[PDB]
């Protein structure tokens, strides 16, 4: 699962809500460790 | 990740540090269990 | 690992112990979530 926020600032106003910023509690390549990362996503690729 | 020590057994002194004894809690035949096991390794196969 | 009980509901007595009801902590399709699950099983396919 991802935690997210609406992307804000530096946008055309007709782009509002089209992008979300989200993050992961996903593991490192070592199986015993964890890292936090985040990425830009189109709203179309996610569902609450 | 594995814990290790520089285990010896009447090692010649030009072999020191070439082998390490290390251990981890592995995986088991059932997803719900773990166990600790150790084995010898050549120094070449590991990095701190 | 499975938690289990003998199924005694609605059963002819020469069938006793042929079925067990059991349950487990196996994962949901989300990587970070789990769900309780249970099913009937034939005694032949399980061991203590």
């Amino acid at each position, epitope marked *: 699962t991802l935690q997210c926020t609406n992307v804000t600032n530096n946008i055309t106003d007709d782009m509002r809500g089209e992008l979300k910023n989200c993050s992961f509690n*996903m593991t490192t390549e070592l199986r015993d460790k964890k890292q936090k990362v985040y990425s830009l996503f189109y709203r179309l690729d996610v569902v609450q | 990740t594995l814990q290790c020590t520089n285990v010896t057994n009447n090692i010649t002194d030009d072999m020191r540090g070439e082998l390490k004894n290390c251990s981890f809690n592995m995986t088991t035949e059932l997803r719900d269990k773990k166990q600790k096991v150790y084995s010898l390794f050549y120094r070449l196969d590991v990095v701190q | 690992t499975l938690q289990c009980t003998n199924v005694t509901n609605n059963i002819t007595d020469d069938m006793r112990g042929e079925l067990k009801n059991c349950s487990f902590n196996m*994962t949901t399709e989300l*990587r970070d979530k789990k769900q309780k699950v249970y099913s009937l099983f034939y005694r032949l396919d399980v061991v203590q």
Partner: antibody
Amino acid sequence: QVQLVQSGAEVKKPGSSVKVSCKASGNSFSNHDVHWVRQATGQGLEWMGWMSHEGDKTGLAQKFQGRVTITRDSGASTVYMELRGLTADDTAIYYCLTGSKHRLRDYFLYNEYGPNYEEWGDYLATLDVWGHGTAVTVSS
Amino acid sequence: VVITQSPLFLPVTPGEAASLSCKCSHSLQHSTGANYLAWYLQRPGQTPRLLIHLATHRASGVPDRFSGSGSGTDFTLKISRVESDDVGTYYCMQGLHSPWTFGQGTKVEIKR
């Protein structure tokens, strides 16, 4: 009722360390949390620190950081605590008590090809029965 | 995380119900729904004894006069029919977050 034993009361000079010990009959420390508590007459209880019944965790109330340690005899039949830097305002009744905890996974990721990533933690549930305690005071 | 308790002390008329409260900066509830709250009584001249625990039950061998309440940041301890042997001080405790802590406590004393 497990018997509990603690060190006799002691007077110590200001600016210096003291040490205490405790015991549980039947080597029941293996099944209980080690705890230390401090109290002053006319004042509320203060947790000092603990050790897990597995012995794989220890800790201190933050007031004691860098002044306290906890050790035990092999096979955990007894436990010890050392206090450092004591001054006259450290006069208190000290206690050793047994305890209980709840260990619950706090986070997980299932892995198809390996052990599940897991996070765990301890929540104290109850204090178990209190030791008779020790008294420690500090004077010239 | 911090803990407080009130009233600092309570005068008591014998044979009458009375209660104590404990509050803290964060809920004592856990994601499992577990609560890590416990109350203790210290008679003077004696070590403390568990009264209730995990915000849900009396400790074994505790009189049934004992009860408690609440959720989240607020909890109470109540004793119906308070008796002179309930004199002493009381402490709420948090096992939910490190370092484990006690409330500042309250004192029960018979009114005079």
